[PDB]
């Protein structure tokens, strides 16, 4: 539906949609921009990420509300209210899965294969792990282990590149480690791995802060605080 709009106009309108808090529109504009077939700049990658994270974030929050109601409905002593809670949870779940599949499809056709610089490749592989992780959050059936392993594999490739090619304070490296640590804690039932990763990431970043400008220091320490927040919650 965006095929007739100029790439630059799609990017301009994505920024307007962000200012207006119209994240579904923002995501549709950025999908159109990706589908023009050119690589994305750093700024454009962050617009793509902001848009879809906000869309899926609303869906995930709604899914958790509905899942909790459904859980309470199946406790002993609960009155039978019919199929409606399950149906509506399933409706929201299917829409969420559709958004994840859309993002994964953009990554596979063809953002990842054309991404050669570490900053872009790690960014996209982190995104791939993230959207498999969101699929894992709602998965219950025969492919659940494979969904979890797909998240793990994408995160692991991103980590390997990030450790070789980026300083320990790089914000993409830090955000990747934050999210892989959450994956370990919440998805893979590996809280010790989650804690170890968060701590090592924090400590290695701390030791590299001395190399940074004031502005880079602000960027890196903001994400380090997110790691610390999780360590405080988990220990």
């Amino acid at each position: 539906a965006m095929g007739s709009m100029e790439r630059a106009s799609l990017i301009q309108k994505a920024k307007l949609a962000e200012q207006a808090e119209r994240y579904e529109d923002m995501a549709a504009f950025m999908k159109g921009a990706v589908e023009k077939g050119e690589e994305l700049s750093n700024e454009e990658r962050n617009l793509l990420s902001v848009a879809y994270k906000n869309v899926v974030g609303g869906q995930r929050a709604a899914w958790r509300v509905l899942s909790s109601i459904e859980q309470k409905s199946n406790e002993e002593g609960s009155e039978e209210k019919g199929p409606e809670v399950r149906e509506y949870r399933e409706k929201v779940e299917t829409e969420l899965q559709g958004v994840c599949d859309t993002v994964l499809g953009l990554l596979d056709s063809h953002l990842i294969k054309e991404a050669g610089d570490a900053e872009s490749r790690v960014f996209y592989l982190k995104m791939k792990g993230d959207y498999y992780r969101y699929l894992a959050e709602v998965a219950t059936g025969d492919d659940k282990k494979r969904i979890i392993d797909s998240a793990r594999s994408a995160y692991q490739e991103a980590m390997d590149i990030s450790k070789k090619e980026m300083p320990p304070t790089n914000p993409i490296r830090l955000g990747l480690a934050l999210n892989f640590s959450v994956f370990h804690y919440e998805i893979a039932n590996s809280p010790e791995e989650a804690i170890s990763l968060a701590k090592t990431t924090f400590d290695e970043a701390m030791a590299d802060l001395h190399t940074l400008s004031e502005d880079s220091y602000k960027d890196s320490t903001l994400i380090m605080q997110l790691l610390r927040d999780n360590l405080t919650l988990w220990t």
Binding site: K53, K126, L178, N179, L226, D229, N230, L233, W234
Partner: peptide, 8 residues
């Protein structure tokens, strides 16, 4: 009280 992931 909800753990943090990479957002904004």
């Amino acid at each position: 009280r909800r753990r943090k992931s990479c957002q904004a």
